[PDB]
Amino acid sequence: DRQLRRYLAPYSAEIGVDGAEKMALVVLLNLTLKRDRVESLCDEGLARQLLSDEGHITNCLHTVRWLHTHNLKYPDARVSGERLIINAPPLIPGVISSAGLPMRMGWAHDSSDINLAKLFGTSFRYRDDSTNLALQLVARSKTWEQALIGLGLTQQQLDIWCQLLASNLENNTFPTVVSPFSKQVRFLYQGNYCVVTPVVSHALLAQLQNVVHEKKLQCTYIHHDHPASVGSLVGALGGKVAVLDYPPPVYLHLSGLTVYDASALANPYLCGIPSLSALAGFCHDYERRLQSLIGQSVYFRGLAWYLGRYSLVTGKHLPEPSKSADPKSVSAIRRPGLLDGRYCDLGMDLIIEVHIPTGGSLPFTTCLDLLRVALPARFAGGCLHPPSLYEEYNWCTVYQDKSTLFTVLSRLPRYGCWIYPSDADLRSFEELSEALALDRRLRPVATGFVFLEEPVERAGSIEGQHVYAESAIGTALCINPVEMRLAGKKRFFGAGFWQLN
Amino acid sequence: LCTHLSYSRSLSPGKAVFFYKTAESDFVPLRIEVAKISGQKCGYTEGFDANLKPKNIERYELAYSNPQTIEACYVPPNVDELYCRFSLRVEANSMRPYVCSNPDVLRVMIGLAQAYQRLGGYNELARRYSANVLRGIWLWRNQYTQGTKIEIKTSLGSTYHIPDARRLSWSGDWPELEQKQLEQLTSEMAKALSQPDIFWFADVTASLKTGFCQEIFPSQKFTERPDDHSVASRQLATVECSDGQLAACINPQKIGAALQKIDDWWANDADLPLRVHEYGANHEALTALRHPATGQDFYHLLTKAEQFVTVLESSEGGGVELPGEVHYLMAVLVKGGLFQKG
Amino acid sequence: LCTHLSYSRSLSPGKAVFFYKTAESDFVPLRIEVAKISGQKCGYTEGFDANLKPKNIERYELAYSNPQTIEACYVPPNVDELYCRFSLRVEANSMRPYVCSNPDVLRVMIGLAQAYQRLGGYNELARRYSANVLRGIWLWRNQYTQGTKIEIKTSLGSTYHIPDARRLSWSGDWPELEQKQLEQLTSEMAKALSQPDIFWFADVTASLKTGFCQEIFPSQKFTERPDDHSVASRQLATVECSDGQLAACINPQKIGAALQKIDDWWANDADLPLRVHEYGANHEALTALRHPATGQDFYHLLTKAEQFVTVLESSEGGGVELPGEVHYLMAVLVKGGLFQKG
DNA sequence: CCCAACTTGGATGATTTCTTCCAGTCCTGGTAA
DNA sequence: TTACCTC
């Protein structure tokens, strides 16, 4: 029955094998063959025959060297180098992450080990905990060894394997250099800059594939070409991976801004409102440009976000032919590869809280011109433009009064959205499911990164220290213009502004 | 050189939209429609196998139709003019590397950009970009009209007007009161490209006089083959208007590829100009004009900067001395990208 | 042959719209009606099975009606003349491959089109296309009028007038003053087909003198199988006017299928012409005249181009010496498409 | 300005829901010996 | 210079 293969798949709930160790070794060994050659995973004879083939088992033992907890190749098969094995970070009350999940491993090396990797990398429930075959043999678990010798293995063959099998899990747990095809982004940390490289958690993604189908959550699917070249889970899922889909229900004042082709996929787990880490980023690049123009110190305490238009764009971009078919003696150009992403067009206003340290300020026309010049051209991976020239008004006004500014903001069209920070603390997708079932204003968002290690010096870093991290999933509220007309200026200026830390 | 070096793009456009006017409202969008058609069974593998070995089918088997689903777009009856427009911003952003892993490489790239600026040369790039705007080649396959007018406004207050764009060539000399506007536009752009702290923004509109129900050609989407047979095989690009309706459009990078088609520096024989590319890619012929084997590509040339700066510094300037290799390189830096592993 | 080879479409109409005039306004659209009818229970399988015992039905079971939903279209009372209108553009676009991956194939295809042009031959194709416009065969099933008057205007200032098109044959000699206009129109088009950068348009209107409430036959939709008993089994095509009304029309490719029906070069017996097709498909008899098994199709012929150029070059030309195989090939290149995977 | 605004008895019968044959491609991967 | 594989 195909249901046995389903329950042993990385995307299914784990099953118990206590008292069945003999048939568990038979089924797990039988999985190393192509489906076309096997009439049943339960034939003891085939298993006894496969076990005697030291070459077949040796080829299987070799796959252990690339078992991982986090997958550096997930979004792009071109990444080359070492595996990554790290214990989940400490739990943060306000963030959904792998911190609340038990320990699990997966596999991803040359794309030809799909079957041979299944003997040691397949997990199951045993002694009421989560384990796999490699761990039970390395730990010298006698019940499994007694069944394995009973199935025809020589004690001397087991005594050697325990050593080689253990050795493959004792080194190469952290990459030596930063790989040339990895991502690098930099922010301020403890008064200085650090480069962050995100990575996807195996345990966290595999759980999400089950929860969205069981709890009936809003979701879509992302495609991957050549699934065998990306990983255990992506292959098992046939190249289609599910993600969450939660779109919105649609002092310096910047009005009428238009963004073309913004990235609608915030993190590999969630589609919806663009990642908040990107807006914090934007505020700062804008601040640095202005600071190089005005001699006085200028600093941004907070940043607010308003949504007037939100349109999803279908399809995907075609890459430029930047790769020669052959390095020499060939006059043919090839396409690097294709990715499956999601994009949208935005219309939005920003209200920035600008502060000048010096006692004497520069509230002049000159500074308004410099505020127009400093404005970046890039936003959320897309292209940012001012309102069209033929209908231009003062899109860059400045207020030094909360009463005048709030009065003007209360006049905004009723079909738009203000996005506010949330209060609720969520530690799992199941808690998120309940919070979303109860409210109608609540949406999940990407909020930032959680570190896997302390910052260090590492070859390949763009600037200063380097650290690995996993994406942080949090939440936000969508508030109608009608609700703040009634809440008052007091609540708006206390709750309506976002900051880092 | 060094492990990492890269530039971002200095010249970026918007999304173009098609619309028309009525006596009742100033902005009505042009929209697309979807329909079932009866196709033909033709082409190889339909009748031949291997290398011209007929396959065994009966005579009547090719007389059958092949149905298909497509999207299409036509101008409705009695509309005299169709209008199209887009926005453009230009930044002086080739003066500094986005990233660079080596201070010794960095000071040299800076030296070169400046050595070039003061001898002239930005005028040359500006003249070429300006010509492509006023010619109208960014309409691609929609240039076949009974008359085309182009109008441009900028943030500095200037206005330009081409009474009829259908005759302006790449090579040649323009009519009076047209040649002159090209000179004036060149000046605004040549500055915008190289001097920082100037905000510049342009708004380009054009009008097309058309036939009774002429077909219109907007950008096409990239898609998977549907498995349903109820979903279109050829889907067209549209933009959402402020009122919620959809309209036909041309994608930003499709407008962009047209504006930068200025490279007629290859092989000392101008022909037609190429889209700037590090390897000289030629899409029509499926080949490359600056194959690495020739020594004419960007990556070989990127290593001669020390020699070029030396010449630029020794030259008097203001003349015609700047070589093809220096102009080429500056054009590539303008279309910034990744130049790593050097 | 080679992997990539494509040509574009060099000759094309927009769509045709039916309308009439009144004393107050110059453009009133013809519209369609929707209705339920009572049909017949008839035809084989109604009463038979594999032509054996005719089932087990009582005599009364076939007397019952079969209801259906259809769309229909009639001219309203007291309208004396109905008008039909469309526009046509022609491009000199068979002189060069849109895409070609093989430089040796490319030089030959160019040499051939040029060798052909200068010996005559575009005149021949122009005459054949021109005859079909003036004859009126693009009205399909609506030719049964009390009188058909055809008027044509072009972008060069010419005007043509056929007072009554109902009787001009494919084969025969046209009466005087009509033979003359066929020659003049041929000349304008012969140029449009072969000289680049001429922006040529034609604008064709015909008048139909009709019956009291005569039925009209516009294009049908190709529809999905119904199962809701609510959707019409037969649906007609319309266009949306700028004011929101719908009007009856004929599709672009339906007009085109008629204009390009000029192929009587097979079997040494002209008969009636076929729509140009790589395999010589005949829809009336459900067969194919240039089946690959005969050696008469496009693909066999495409491989002999080197030999045809050689012959043309050795010939004198200007006369009637060009063979059927060369004319066929040029006609196919005019209706461009994909010719690939050699 | 100012005052009113209506109860009742009732809402169909017969039998039928069609057919023919078709469903196009091509360029776009890492990894090992 | 050659091939080997994901429901």
SS (H, E, C) B234-259: ECECEEECCCCCEEEEECHHHHHHHH
**Does the nearest atom of strand D lie within 7 Å of C39's Cβ?**
yes
C-alpha A66/C-alpha B147 separation (Å) is 65
Cβ distance C86 to B212 less than 8 Å, yes or no, reads yes
In a domain, C299, yes or no: yes
| Same domain flag for B204 and B87 | yes
Selection from A375, A390, A388 nearest residue B87 by Cα: A388
C-alpha B203/C-alpha B185 separation (Å) is 13
C1' of D23 to CA of B65 (Å): 9
C1' of D26 to CA of B226 (Å): 16
C-alpha A481/C-alpha A412 separation (Å) is 7
Place of tokens 């962009």: B256
Strand partners, B20: B28
Side chain identity at residue C319, one-letter code: G
In a domain, B265, yes or no: yes
Residues 6+ apart with CB under 8 A from B9: B93, B335, B336, B337
C-alpha A12/C-alpha A124 separation (Å) is 11
The C-alpha torsion from A202 through A207 and A213 to A216, rounded to 10°, is -120
**Does the nearest atom of strand E lie within 7 Å of A236's Cβ?**
yes
Side chain identity at residue B45, one-letter code: T
C-alpha C83/C-alpha C74 separation (Å) is 14
Instruction: Indicate the SS3 state at residue A223.
Output: strand
What is the nearest CA distance from A80 to chain B, expressed in angstroms?
A: 16
Place of tokens 């085109």: C256
Q: For testing the chain C interface, which of B25, B41, B42 should be mutated: the one with the most C CBs within 10 Å?
A: B42
Instruction: Indicate the SS3 state at residue C235.
Output: coil
Residues 6+ apart with CB under 8 A from C144: none
| Same domain flag for C15 and C161 | yes
Residues 6+ apart with CB under 8 A from B205: B83, B84, B85, B150, B151, B152
Q: How many CA atoms lie within 13 A of C4 on its CB side?
A: 12
Task: Name the C residues in 173-232 with CB < 8 Å from any B CB.
Answer: 199, 201, 203, 221-224
Burial call B189-206: b when 16+ CB within 10 Å, e when fewer? bbbbbbeeebbbbbbbeb
**Does the nearest atom of strand D lie within 7 Å of B40's Cβ?**
yes
Residues 6+ apart with CB under 8 A from C34: C69, C70, C71, C72, C232
**Does the nearest atom of strand D lie within 7 Å of A77's Cβ?**
yes
Q: How many CA atoms lie within 13 A of A349 on its CB side?
A: 17
Place of tokens 């309940």: A434
What DSSP state is assigned to residue B225? P
C-alpha A215/C-alpha B102 separation (Å) is 53
**Chain CA centroid to CA B203, Å:** 17
CA closest to B286 among chain C residues = C101
Selection from B89, B126, B92, B93 nearest residue B201 by Cα: B89
Nearest to B48 among C14, C89, C292 (CB): C292
Is the distance from CB of C112 to CB of C305 less than 8 angstroms?
Answer: yes
Contact residues on chain C for B166, CB-CB shorter than 8 A: 199
Cβ distance B252 to A260 less than 8 Å, yes or no, reads yes
Please state the length of chain B: 342
C-alpha B166/C-alpha B209 separation (Å) is 12
C-alpha B203/C-alpha A388 separation (Å) is 8
What is the nearest CA distance from C299 to chain B, expressed in angstroms?
A: 8
Handedness of CA A130, A132, A137, A142 (dihedral sign): positive
Experimental method: cryo-EM
Please report, for chain A, how many H helices and E strands are present, in that order: 16, 22
Is the distance from CB of A54 to CB of A154 less than 8 angstroms?
Answer: no
A 266-325, residues with C-beta < 7 Å of strand E = none
**Does the nearest atom of strand E lie within 7 Å of A35's Cβ?**
yes
| Same domain flag for B82 and B129 | yes
Closest residue (CA) to C1' of nucleotide D21 is: B64
| Same domain flag for C184 and C87 | yes
Residues 6+ apart with CB under 8 A from C105: C1, C2, C5
C-alpha C180/C-alpha C161 separation (Å) is 11
Strand partners, B67: B38
Handedness of CA A186, A187, A192, A195 (dihedral sign): negative
Q: For testing the chain A interface, which of B90, B201, B249 should be mutated: the one with the most A CBs within 10 Å?
A: B201
Instruction: Indicate the SS3 state at residue C245.
Output: coil
| Same domain flag for C108 and C158 | no
What is the nearest CA distance from A382 to chain B, expressed in angstroms?
A: 11
In a domain, B239, yes or no: no
In a domain, B194, yes or no: yes
What DSSP state is assigned to residue A325? S
Contact residues on chain C for B45, CB-CB shorter than 8 A: 341
- Tell me the DSSP string of A13-81: ---B-TT-HHHHHHHHHHTTS-GGG-S-TT-HHHHHHHHT-HHHHHHHHHGGGGEESEETTTT-TT--S
Q: How many CA atoms lie within 13 A of A186 on its CB side?
A: 14
| Same domain flag for B4 and B130 | no
Report chain C's terminal Cα–Cα distance, integer Å: 5
C-alpha B127/C-alpha C134 separation (Å) is 49
In a domain, C338, yes or no: yes
Is the distance from CB of A145 to CB of A137 less than 8 angstroms?
Answer: yes
Among candidate residues C219, C253, C275, the one where a domain is terminated: C219
Resolution, Å (one decimal):
4.0
DSSP 3-state percent helix, strand, coil across chain C (nearest 5)? 25, 25, 50
Query: For chain B, what is the radius of gyration of the CA atoms?
Result: 24
Report chain A's terminal Cα–Cα distance, integer Å: 53
C1' of D33 to CA of A51 (Å): 26
Range of the domain at C310: 1-9+93-121+261-342
* The pair of three-digit structure tokens given for residue C56, joined into one six-digit string: 């087990």
Residues 6+ apart with CB under 8 A from C201: B146, B211, C87, C88, C89, C154, C155
In degrees rounded to 5, what are phi and psi of residue B241?
Answer: -90, 170
| Same domain flag for B83 and B205 | yes
| Same domain flag for B292 and B330 | yes
In a domain, B187, yes or no: yes
Other Cβ atoms less than 10 A from the Cβ of B187: the count is 14
C-alpha A248/C-alpha A477 separation (Å) is 10
**Chain CA centroid to CA C340, Å:** 25
Selection from A188, A375, A407, A355 nearest residue A277 by Cα: A188
Handedness of CA A456, A461, A467, A468 (dihedral sign): negative
**Does the nearest atom of strand E lie within 7 Å of A235's Cβ?**
yes
* The pair of three-digit structure tokens given for residue C308, joined into one six-digit string: 């045809």
Side chain identity at residue B229, one-letter code: H
In a domain, C81, yes or no: yes
**Does the nearest atom of strand D lie within 7 Å of A301's Cβ?**
no
In degrees rounded to 5, what are phi and psi of residue B272?
Answer: -100, 150
Strands (E), A368-422: 378-379, 382-385, 417-421
Query: For chain A, what is the radius of gyration of the CA atoms?
Result: 27
Residues 6+ apart with CB under 8 A from B194: B92, B95, B117, B122
Instruction: Indicate the SS3 state at residue A268.
Output: coil
In degrees rounded to 5, what are phi and psi of residue B114?
Answer: -70, -40
| Same domain flag for C134 and C201 | yes
Residues 6+ apart with CB under 8 A from B73: B30, B31, B32, B33, B215, B216, B217, B218, B236, B248
| Same domain flag for B317 and B176 | no
Report chain B's terminal Cα–Cα distance, integer Å: 5
Contact residues on chain C for B38, CB-CB shorter than 8 A: 222
Is the distance from CB of A265 to CB of A342 less than 8 angstroms?
Answer: yes
Query: What is the domain count for chain C?
Result: 2
Is B146 in CB contact (< 8 Å) with chain C? Answer: yes
Among candidate residues C156, C189, C219, the one where a domain is terminated: C219
Selection from B121, B252, B105, B256 nearest residue B191 by Cα: B121
| Same domain flag for B190 and B103 | no
C1' of E1 to CA of A330 (Å): 16
* The pair of three-digit structure tokens given for residue C27, joined into one six-digit string: 């453009």
Among candidate residues C187, C219, C251, the one where a domain is terminated: C219
Is the distance from CB of A115 to CB of A34 less than 8 angstroms?
Answer: yes
In a domain, B50, yes or no: no
Side chain identity at residue A337, one-letter code: G
C1' of E2 to CA of A114 (Å): 23
| Same domain flag for B308 and B331 | yes
